[PDB]
Amino acid sequence: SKAKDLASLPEIKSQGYHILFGELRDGEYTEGKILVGYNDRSEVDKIVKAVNGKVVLELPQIKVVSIKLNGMTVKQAYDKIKALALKGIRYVEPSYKRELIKPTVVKPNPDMYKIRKPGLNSTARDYGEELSNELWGLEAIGVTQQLWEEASGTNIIVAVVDTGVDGTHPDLEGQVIAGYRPAFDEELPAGTDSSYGGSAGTHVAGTIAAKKDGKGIVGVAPGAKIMPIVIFDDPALVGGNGYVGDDYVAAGIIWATDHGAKVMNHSWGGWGYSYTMKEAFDYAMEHGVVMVVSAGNNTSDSHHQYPAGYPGVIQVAALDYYGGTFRVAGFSSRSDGVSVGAPGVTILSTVPGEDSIGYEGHNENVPATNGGTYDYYQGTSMAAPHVTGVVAVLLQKFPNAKPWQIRKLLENTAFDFNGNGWDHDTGYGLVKLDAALQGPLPTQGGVEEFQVVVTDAKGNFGVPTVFVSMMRDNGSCYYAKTGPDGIARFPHIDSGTYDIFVGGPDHWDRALAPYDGESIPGGYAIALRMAEERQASFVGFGVSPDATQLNVNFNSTLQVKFSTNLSTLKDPQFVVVDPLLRGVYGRVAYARNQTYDLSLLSGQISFGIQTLLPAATDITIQGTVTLNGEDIPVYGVLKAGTTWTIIDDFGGLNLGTDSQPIYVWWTIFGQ
Ligand SMILES: [Ca+2]
DSSP: OOOSOSTTOOBOOOOOOOOOBOOOOTTSBOTTEEEEEESSHHHHHHHHHHHTOEEEEEEGGGTEEEEEOSSOOHHHHHHHHTTSOOSSEEEEEOOBOOEEOOOEEOOOOTTTTOSSSSOOSSSTTOOSSTTGGGOHHHHHTTOOHHHHHHOSOTTOEEEEEESOOBTTSGGGTTTBOOEEEGGGTEEEOTTOBOOTTOSHHHHHHHHHHOOOSSSSOOOSOTTSEEEEEESBOOHHHHOTTSBOOHHHHHHHHHHHHHTTOSEEEEOEEBSOOOHHHHHHHHHHHHTTOEEEEEOOSOSSSOOOOBTTTSTTOEEEEEEEEETTEEEEOSSSOOOTTEEEEEEOSSEEEEOOOTTSTTOOOOOTTOOOSSSOOEEEEESHHHHHHHHHHHHHHHHHHOTTOOHHHHHHHHHHHOBOSSSSSOBTTTBTOBOOHHHHHHOOOOSSSEEEEEEEEEEOTTSOSBOTTEEEEEEOSSSOOEEEEOOTTSEEEEEEEEOEEEEEEEEEEOOOSOOSOTTTSOOOOOSOSSOSOGGGOOEEEEEEEEEBTTBOEEEEEOOOOEEEEEOOOOTTSSSOEEEEEOTTOSOEEEEEEOOTTOEEEOTTOEEEEEEEEEOSSOOSSOEEEEEEEEETTEEEEEEEEEOTTOSEEEEBTTSSOBSSOSSSOOBOOEEEEOO
16 A cells, blocks of 8 residues: 555554565576565466566466566566565565586596505406496495395486486486476476486486496496486577576476475585575475485585575585595585585596487597497586485385485495594595495484574564574584575474574665665665664574474664754654555654654654644754664655655655655564
């Protein structure tokens, strides 16, 4: 609703907090499209009309609708939405930029993991395939033909979320089942070439499940099946670098989950924290699917934070072997989130053939006799598939395992080659399939879900975009942002003791020119000022199946005092109003130099002044707002001929329009 007169506005109850908008960072997001997380699908139609956009994807499984903007930027769409006063919308965000953590080619190395490594004599690498001698990674993780006799991934479907897979490769015959190309809602028939984005996905597929048939190589889980999900498509068809967008990736993840995938392999990422992607990953894990994600690609590219950074995933580091010891590959991003490391250097696997869609070259010296093409790659993207393969084998033996149990089993059985037990480079060590398969499956060490719920003082409204950091001296740290209901969810994380830090709404909507100057907030963030941020710390908090939730109650103080003499005005009153002018929270006689204490109010408000009779001349009204102890000057101008005005640190600023107003607001949580 809108308003024209302040004195005529009715009294209303707290309206909660502002709509949750995804942070906008130059060069970090795709232009012309918005992803809308909703509760009430009908409310999305109010956004479609406001931006006159077109719905291009509906994902009811996670209540998301993607809207194409048709000649408007994301920022402009936010401007059309920010003052609409929607109630059943969870968030509005762009699709963020993501890149594949690209593997690089390396030359074969006959000495790799040899000489006093781990049994390099008398059929050391006897897997039955002609190229077995070169599969040092299988030897490193403890694979043996005898082990496959017990478990090999039978009936387990593995989703390779990547560039697509050349299912026509001879070493993948019978191994690639029906998949999905979300960009075009196109089903990919079993055994077909879907390598639209290049060679990576095929290399991944071979490491995981190349066929055990005496020829070429063999995967970690030769009994498993590969379900290709194309998220890096042909850039000539989808533009950019081929990334299909956070919305289409979510569609692909949902499709894979709905169609039976029990583990997915991911080696891509970007800086943007996406609520949509969080929802998709959590959807898959809630359905019991394990999500393996490669650790970052390097330092220069401080991106690829997500999806690797979402709590619950199994993050994998790349391991090399030289000088008789395992070691982090180097290009592997160091992070406390790394669970385990796996072979990721000189990994021989399947690549698309010369006339296949995703051909990117091959090593012609590989002595294969099946007419197939192979190449040696290095990278964290070469390590993750080893772990995905190990998970597939484990899921055959422990069909009832929950994702946290699979991750803890891997960490509990990893080979600590460094001797320190755990570190930010390789987590708990080298993944070991043989030790992991022995089990048993852990019954303790993790929780299906831990939540941190942040609300205002009385616990009436959840506070959105509050950062929640779970830190500890050793082990993985976790991070998540609260959603519209104030909840930050942590699925399948470790049980144990953490130091948990919570930080007030995120004030990313700066009001100063990046080039060092003065500006104005767009009104996109929940809070407009650093002074509104609240913090809480809970040291030694114990997370376990008996303590799965932490409730945090924010509080604040707010006082306002005006210094201007308004004796020339008729019955001047100080008014606390809704920023959208939907109504008022209270009116009181104006008193110069009188301090009004609003510390008990919670939510988002604006300040105004009204008079019974119109002002004869312009009058500037000035005051001081003391917010959480910080003094902030405020002012506004009551124009001649008018009976009301707004007062704030920007002079009484409407961030919206006359028709759809949204005045600068003050974010508080009560007491
Ligand atoms: Ca083979």
